[PDB]
Amino acid sequence: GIVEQXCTSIXSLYQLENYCN
Amino acid sequence: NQHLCGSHLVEALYLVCGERGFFYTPKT
């Protein structure tokens, strides 16, 4: 999930915004 | 460049998602 995408790998602001409600 | 981990991740979600909150996986 997000730990893989943002912490282990690199995530952009665009990907982070995909988690917003 | 940098990885987003720990408290930094949760705080970034506060700003990016604002008062709406967030999910553990994308809603689409």
Curated annotation (Swiss-Prot), chain B:
Stretches of the chain forming a coiled coil according to its record: none
Protein name: Insulin B chain
Protein species of origin: Homo sapiens (Human)
Native organism taxonomy: Eukaryota, Metazoa, Chordata, Craniata, Vertebrata
Gene that produces this protein: INS
